[PDB]
Design a protein around this ligand. Sequence first.
Ligand SMILES: CCCCC(=O)N(CCCC)Cc1ccc(C(=O)NO)cc1
Ligand SMILES: [K+]
Ligand SMILES: [K+]
Ligand SMILES: [Zn+2]
Length: 358
Amino acid sequence: SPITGLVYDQRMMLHHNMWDSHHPELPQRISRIFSRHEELRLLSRCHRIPARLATEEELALCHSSKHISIIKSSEHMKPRDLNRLGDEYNSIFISNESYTCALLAAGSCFNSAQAILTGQVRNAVAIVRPPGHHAEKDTACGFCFFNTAALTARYAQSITRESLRVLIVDWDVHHGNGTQHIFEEDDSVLYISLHRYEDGAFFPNSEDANYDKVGLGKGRGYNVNIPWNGGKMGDPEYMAAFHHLVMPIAREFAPELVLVSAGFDAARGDPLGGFQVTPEGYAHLTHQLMSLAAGRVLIILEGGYNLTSISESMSMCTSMLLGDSPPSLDHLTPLKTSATVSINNVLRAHAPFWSSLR
Ligand SMILES: CCCCC(=O)N(CCCC)Cc1ccc(C(=O)NO)cc1
Ligand SMILES: [K+]
Ligand SMILES: [K+]
Ligand SMILES: [Zn+2]
């Protein structure tokens, strides 16, 4: 009988915005998600995995010493220096606890990946903040200090073998620019992101997120960007992108571990997303991914800012991991026109690299 792991530690709530207590990357994101897991009796069904701090050596798997040093130094900064330092980055706020919280998010994911790979659990869910996928080797960005998901891929390889095949599926509504760049030349880590794009008119505002960035060097083919160019994208479009692109390429890659950069800011009612993926939609995406890697799937919270939407949606993913039957989902609504164009563009760009694409 498969076991699902869950990691959550309330200390990650201590990271906060000292100048706008209502900033959407709120401490209560993770406490609300946790409370919903309790209310729905999902937590009791999971094997509880402890949180830990990542070490500086583990952060060096993906991040420069200079970047680690500056964020580490924030732990001891006065408020005015914390405000100045955060303003040096694109969309970062920093408190004295931010470094420790970012370490806890990553270490929680390391312990979860270790639990999966050593067979203590089949799959796992990590209710963590601050998020990770915008963080670059050398810089913080977009509410993210260290790239939790990228680090976890490298940590996984470190405790198994260097060539362990890791799939990172990033379904946060924004492009994980950091994850793409860290693995852009790497054919051991397949990065697939779906994201609102709008010709660069959506954070992180760069053409790096377009469908024609397919990877570099021996990494060519191992970066798959599925960019959306409309709005009100929802279950039909995400289901179709998984059917035509994500699952065929993932099967051809044959990952041994699946990490999900699981932002829930493509969910209904999110001012930072504008999309309408339903909890049932997220369930179906999770369940499709469980078909890979002998079920070795780790779900990692990234963004997502409507407290009710992220709590319902992430709980539905945990329900899928636990083996519950996927809910009824509509399969008949026609796609938005732009979404057919996006999927077609990615298929044409990735035809050279993935023989099973049609
Ligand atoms: C101000 C420009 C319009 C909004 C914007 O671009 N912002 C918001 C700044 C504060 C809300 C930066 C941002 C947005 C989303 C994420 C995220 O959710 N990533 O996964 C990260 C960073
Ligand atoms: K994404
Ligand atoms: K890659
Ligand atoms: Zn996001």
